[PDB]
Amino acid sequence: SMIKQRTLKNIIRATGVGLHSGEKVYLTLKPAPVDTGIVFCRTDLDPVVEIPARAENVGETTMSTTLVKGDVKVDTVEHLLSAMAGLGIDNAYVELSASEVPIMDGSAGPFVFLIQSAGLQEQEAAKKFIRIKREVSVEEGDKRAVFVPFDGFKVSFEIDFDHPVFRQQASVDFSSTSFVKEVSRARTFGFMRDIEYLRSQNLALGGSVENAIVVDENRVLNEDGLRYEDEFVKHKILDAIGDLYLLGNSLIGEFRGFKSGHALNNQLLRTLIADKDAWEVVTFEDARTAP
Ligand SMILES: COc1ncc(COc2ccc(C3=CCN(CC[C@@](C)(C(=O)NO)S(C)(=O)=O)C(=O)C3)cc2)cc1Cl
Ligand SMILES: [Zn+2]
Numbered sequence: 616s617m618i619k620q621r622t623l624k625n626i627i628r629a630t631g632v633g634l635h636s637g638e639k640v641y642l643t644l645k646p647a648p649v650d651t652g653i654v655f656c657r658t659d660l661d662p663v664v665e666i667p668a669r670a671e672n673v674g675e676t677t678m679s680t681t682l683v684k685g686d687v688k689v690d691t692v693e694h695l696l697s698a699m700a701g702l703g704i705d706n707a708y709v710e711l712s713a714s715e716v717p718i719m720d721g722s723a724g725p726f727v728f729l730i731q732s733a734g735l736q737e738q739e740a741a742k743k744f745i746r747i748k749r750e751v752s753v754e755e756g757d758k759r760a761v762f763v764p765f766d767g768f769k770v771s772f773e774i775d776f777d778h779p780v781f782r783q784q785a786s787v788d789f790s791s792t793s794f795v796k797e798v799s800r801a802r803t804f805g806f807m808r809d810i811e812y813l814r815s816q817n818l819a820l821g822g823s824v825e826n827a828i829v830v831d832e833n834r835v836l837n838e839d840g841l842r843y844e845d846e847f848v849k850h851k852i853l854d855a856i857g858d859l860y861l862l863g864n865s866l867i868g869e870f871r872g873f874k875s876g877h878a879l880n881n882q883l884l885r886t887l888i889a890d891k892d893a894w895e896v897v898t899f900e901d902a903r904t905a906p
Contacts, residue, residue, distance in 0.1 A: 616902060617741055617898075617899060617900045617901075617902065618741065618742045618898070618899040618902055618905060619737045619738055619739065619740060619741065619742055620649050620650070620705040620706060620737070620738040620740045620741070620742050620743075621702075621703055621704055621705050621706070621735050621736065621737055621738065621742070622646040622647050622648075622649075622651075622704065622705065622706040622707060622735070622736050622738055623644055623645065623646045623647075623704065623707055623730065623733055623734070623735065623736065624646070624733055624734035624735055624736040625646075625733040625734060626643065626644065626645055626646075626733070627643070627644035627645075627729045627730060627732075627733045628641070628642065628643050628644075629641075629642045629717060629719070629725065629726075629729055630642070630717065631717025631718055631719050632717060632718065632821040633690060633691065633713065633714070633715030633716070633717065633718065633820070633821050634679070634691055634715070634718035634721075634803070634819060634820075634821050634822055634826065634827070635678055635679065635690060635691060635715060635817075635818050635819055635820060635821065635822075636690065636713070636714060636715045636817075636820055636821065637820030637821035638713045638714070638715060638821075639713070640711055640712055640713035640715060640716070640717050641711070641712040641713075642709065642710065642711055642712075642716065642717055643658075643708075643709075643710040643711075644707055644708070644709055644710075644729070644730070644733070645707065645708040645709075645710065646706070646707065646708075646736065647706035647707050647708050648706060648738075649705075649706060649738045649739070649740035650706070650740065651705075651706040651707070651708075652667055652668060652669065652705070652706060652863050653667070653668035653696065653699055653704070653706070653707050653709065653860070653863075654666070654667050654668065654707070654708050654709065655667075655668055655682060655689045655692065655708075655709045655711065656708055656709065656710045656711070657687055657689065657711055657712075657713075657714070658710045658711065658712060659711070659712045659713060660687065664684055664685075664687040665684075665708075666682045666683070666684045666687070666689055667863075668682065668692060668696060668709075668860070668861060668863070669861055669862075669863050670861045670862065670863075670881060670884040670885060670888060672684060673861060673881045674688065676876070676877040676878035676880075676881055677878070678691075678818055678819075678877075679691035679692075679693060679877060680692050680693040680696075680857070680858055680861070680877045680880075680881070687714075688714050689711060689714060689715075689716070690714055690715035690716065691715050691716045691718070692716055692857065693853075693854050693857035693858055693877065694716070694718075694719075694721075694722065694723050694726065694803070694853065694854075694857060695709065695716050695723070695726050695857070696856075696857035696858070696860045696861070697723045697798075697799075697853045697854065697856040697857030697860070698723040698726035698727045698730060698799065698857075699726075699730075699857075699860060700856050700857060700859070700860035700865065701723065701727060701794035701795065701798065701799060701856060702727060702730055702731065702735065702794075702795075703735075703742075703865065704730065704735065705738075705742060705864075706738070718803070718821060718822075718826045718827075719826065720802060720825075720826055721802035721803040721804075721826040721827045721828070722799060722800045722801055722802045722803070722842075722850070722853070723798075723799040723800075723801075723853055723857075724799050724800040727794075727795055727799045741898035741899070741900060742865070742898065742899070743864045743865075743896050743897070743898055744864055744865050744866070744867050744896070744897050744898070744899075745862055745864045745865070745866055745867065745868075745894050745895075745896060745897075746866075746867040746868065746894060746895050746896075746897050747762045747763065747764050747765065747866065747867065747868030747869070747887075747893065747894055748764060748892070748893055748894055748895055749764065749892065749893045750762065750763050750764065750893075751883065751886055751887045751890055751893045752883070753879060753882045753883045753886050755879060755882075757873070757874060758873060758874040758875055758876075758879055759871075759872070759873040759874070759875065759879075760870070760871070760872050760873075760875040760879045760880055760882070760883040761870070761871040761872075761883070762866075762868055762869070762870060762883065762887055762893070763868060763869040763870075763871065764868055764869070765867070765868045765869035766867065766906050767788060767789065767790045767867070767869075767906040768788075768789045768790075768865070768866055768867065768868070768869075768906070769786065769787065769788040769789065769868075769869040769870070770786075770787055770789075770852050770855055770856060770859075770869070770870045770871075770872075771784075771785065771786035771787070771852075771869070771870070771871045771872070772784070772785060772786075772848055772851045772852045772855060772871070772872045772873075772875070773848070773872070773873050773874070774847065774848055774851055774874060775873075775874055776847075778806075778830065779832070779833065780830050780834070780835060781847065783845075783847070783848055784848060785845055785848045785849060785852060787849075787852055790906060794856070797843075797849070798849055798852055798853050798856070799853070800842050800843070801842065801843060801846050801847075801849035801850040801852070801853050802826070802827060802828050802842065802846060802850060803826075803827050803828070803850055804827055804828035804829070804830060804846075804847055804850060805819060805822060805827055805828075805829060805830070806829075806830045806831075807829065807830065807831045807832065807836070808832070810822075810829075824836055824837045824838075828841070828846065828847070851872065851875075854876075854877065854880075855870055855872055855875070855880060858877055858880035858881065858884070859880065859884065861881070861884055862884060862887070862888070864896065867897070867906060
């Protein structure tokens with residue numbers, strides 16, 4: 616039986632604050648027809664401005680992943696897009712009453728729960744996948760992000776913080792591992808060493824122990840502890856999954872990041888897209904060879 620596109624079964628609402636802007640924001644997820652993709656929509660503006668969640672619309676990547684259209688921004692899409700990718704949602708509208716997606720608890724957990732509580736709806740159209748046919752890598756200094764052919768979906772990531780809290784590598788093959796259980800609850804994180812500079816630039820205004828792992832010099836400040844023994848590298852993997860979903864289709868292949876971030880993730884997407892001989896679009900009317 617054919618693998619079909621999926622949208623949301625029902626409308627989903629959530630409230631929160633932007634990690635970086637600190638502004639209160641109302642979020643609304645709505646079903647969308649086949650071949651819509653994920654589309655963000657600023658409903659605080661008149662007319663409403665819609666920005667497709669696609670690599671070509673990525674603006675700055677200095678802190679989070681940001682979408683731009685003219686003068687209009689949608690900040691910090693990566694954790695919600697990761698939740699969307701992890702649940703295989705092809706088509707959806709994401710309405711926002713402000714320029715930044717709410718941070719929630721810092722992870723994708725709340726989004727995957729809200730989505731699954733509403734339910735998913737299968738649609739009468741073949742789901743399209745992007746299959747990696749040949750290796751594609753981008754580098755900058757010692758940082759590196761790579762796509763590798765792989766009959767499945769696998770994300771591996773390595774970070775290199777010289778910090779006592781870290782004393783940092785994980786590979787997740789999603790044919791054996793649940794995104795929901797092992798990745799989705801990984802919270803974003805930041806350092807007291809950086810926060811005075813960030814706040815002076817009006818960044819991370821909404822960040823606190825309520826929505827992030829806050830790492831001091833000599834300890835984590837959150838009194839409740841880590842959700843995963845390797846929560847930090849698992850959050851980087853979460854980030855990559857949402858960043859990679861800006862291809863606009865589920866990936867058949869492997870991502871490897873070494874000290875990568877949103878900027879290098881998007882550069883890898885742009886290199887992949889331009890190298891047409893490195894990938895092809897496939898559907899599964901007969902699912903017997905599907906990974
Ligand atoms: C005593 O006074 C204070 N006490 C506590 C605080 C709060 O402390 C912080 C410090 C940092 C953060 C951040 C949390 C999350 N992030 C995004 C991370 C990223 C990996 C990501 O997850 N992207 O999706 S990244 C680089 O790619 O954007 C940040 O940058 C900073 C939150 C609270 C403040 C004061 Cl003043
Ligand atoms: Zn993140």
